[PDB]
Each structure stands twice: as structure tokens, then as C-alpha cells.
Amino acid sequence: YLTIGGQRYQAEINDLENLGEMGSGTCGQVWKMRFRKTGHVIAVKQMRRSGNDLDVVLKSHDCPYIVQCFGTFITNTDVFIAMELMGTCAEKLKKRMQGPIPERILGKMTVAIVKALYYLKEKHGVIHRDVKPSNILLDERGQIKLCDFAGCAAYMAPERIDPPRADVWSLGISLVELATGQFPYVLTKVLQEEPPLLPGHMGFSGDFQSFVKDCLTKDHRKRPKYNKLLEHSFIKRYETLEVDVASWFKDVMAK
């Protein structure tokens, strides 16, 4: 069963017409396919099986900040998940640009991601727990979204190794990484050094640096629930402020 347009259908993956391969987000190998049945175009990500999910994204179409899932397939080998078509990963842009990302894009981006985080926690009681530039997608439309729920664990909360809210950490690091264009720092600095706040004098909004810091607060307990973050000024500015993200994106890509 594949559901698009608010109606639910079956559904065989061989069913779908295939067009070219698509890559550079997460790999995936991720495909561009069109569903003969409604005429739509979508993305299919393919994975080899292991020993021996994920309904939820399929079950959250009322969030405009999470990339939508159309359904799934299983076979002996793979395992397919189908989702809406998009342009890239944040992280790719980072690498693609060499240069950093304007506080504005991050500002809108930041808003969108926090709202994604909020939705799942309350609506589905989920904790995404993998917030990184890989997991953030941007489009020609200029939309910003999340999926889903050289170190992978570099975004790890300082808490979350010692004592026997994280994401916010991860968020903070992404911003710092994306904002500055350099990864923010194995590990061992994470639990040892100073939280890597936004550069003191890089041209960064006062509002911003507070966000980035407030996220990065070392003691988790003091750390912000998503709810506060939403009220916070940076967030506030950006629900409102008008940013032509798409011409930027659409524009960054020539290069």
C-alpha cells in the first residue's frame, strides 16, 4: 500500500515507473520513480536487508516540516521506503559551498526543524535522536524538512555518556557547523572542553547566538524543552521574517 493525495493504494514497487537514479543526500541508493496509478513523482530509497518501523512518518502528513512517507515495500533483499522528492541534504550544501550558510537560511531552517521535533514528541511521543545536517532537506520550492523517526556520534549530548534534550544538542551543533562551515571541533572534547558557541564576531545576530548557546547548554536539566525554544527570539523572528529561501537554493545550486 502506497498513499499519496490522501488515498491509499497498492502497491508493488515494480509497479512504479522508474526514471534516473538520484544521489548525494544520504545515497541511497535513492531513486526517482513515478506512480502510474495517480501520476505522481516520488523518491524511492532502497536498502539491503539485515537480521533478522517507521510507520509513523507514514502517519504524520499534517506536518509540513517532516518529509512525507508514502508507504513501504519489503522483498527478500530490500526493503523500500517511498517519500516526497526533494533537492538535497543540508550537509551536501555545506560541502558543496565550502562557504557557510547565511544566518537567514539557518534561521528559517532552525524554525522548521524545531517544529518537526515538537510535532513528533507530542503528537507521536517520538524522540528523533538523529539530528544532523544529513537529516535536513531543502528544495527548489525552498521548503525545509526533517527525516525521520568523521563521526556519527559527534553530535552526541554531553549528557548521554556520564550519568546513569539531546537533540537540542544536536541541533545546536548543526547550526554551529552549518553556520561556520567547519565542523565544530575521538570526541573527548565534547565532555571535556567548552561548548563550541558561535564565533564571537562573525556577524551573527545576537538573537542567534543565544539560540545556539541555549541549545548547547552542558547540563541537560537546565536545557530547553522545545517549547521554550519556540518562544525564543530567534525563532520568533523567523516564523515571521521573510526569507526567499528558494531563490537562494535554486541559486546556490549553480556551482
Please say if 62 is a catalytic residue. Answer: no
Instruction: Check whether 44 is labelled as a binding-site residue.
Output: no
Instruction: Check whether 209 is labelled as a binding-site residue.
Output: no
Residue 210: strand pairing partners: none
Instruction: Check whether 107 is labelled as a binding-site residue.
Output: no
- At 146, the amino acid letter reads L
Cα separation, 79 vs 122, in Å, equals 29
Of 165, 169, 158, the C-alpha closest to 216 is 169
Of 98, 223, 242, 246, the C-alpha closest to 171 is 223
Instruction: Check whether 170 is labelled as a binding-site residue.
Output: no
In Å, the largest CA–CA distance within the chain is 56
Instruction: Check whether 24 is labelled as a binding-site residue.
Output: yes
Instruction: Check whether 99 is labelled as a binding-site residue.
Output: no
Give me the catalytic one of 15, 78, 130, 207. Answer: 130
* Contacts for 208 with CB less than 8 Å, ≥ 6 apart: 103, 106, 107, 179, 198, 234
The answer to whether 69 and 81 have CB atoms below 8 angstroms apart is: yes
Cα separation, 20 vs 32, in Å, equals 6
Q: Would residue 142 be called left, alpha or beta, if left means φ above 0 and alpha means ψ between -120 and 50 degrees?
A: left
Q: Is 130 exposed, middle or buried (0-12, 13-18, 19+ CB in 10 A)?
A: middle
Instruction: Check whether 69 is labelled as a binding-site residue.
Output: no
Instruction: Check whether 215 is labelled as a binding-site residue.
Output: no
Bind-site residues for ATP: 22-30, 45
Q: Show which residues are catalytic.
A: 130
Bind-site residues: 22-30, 45
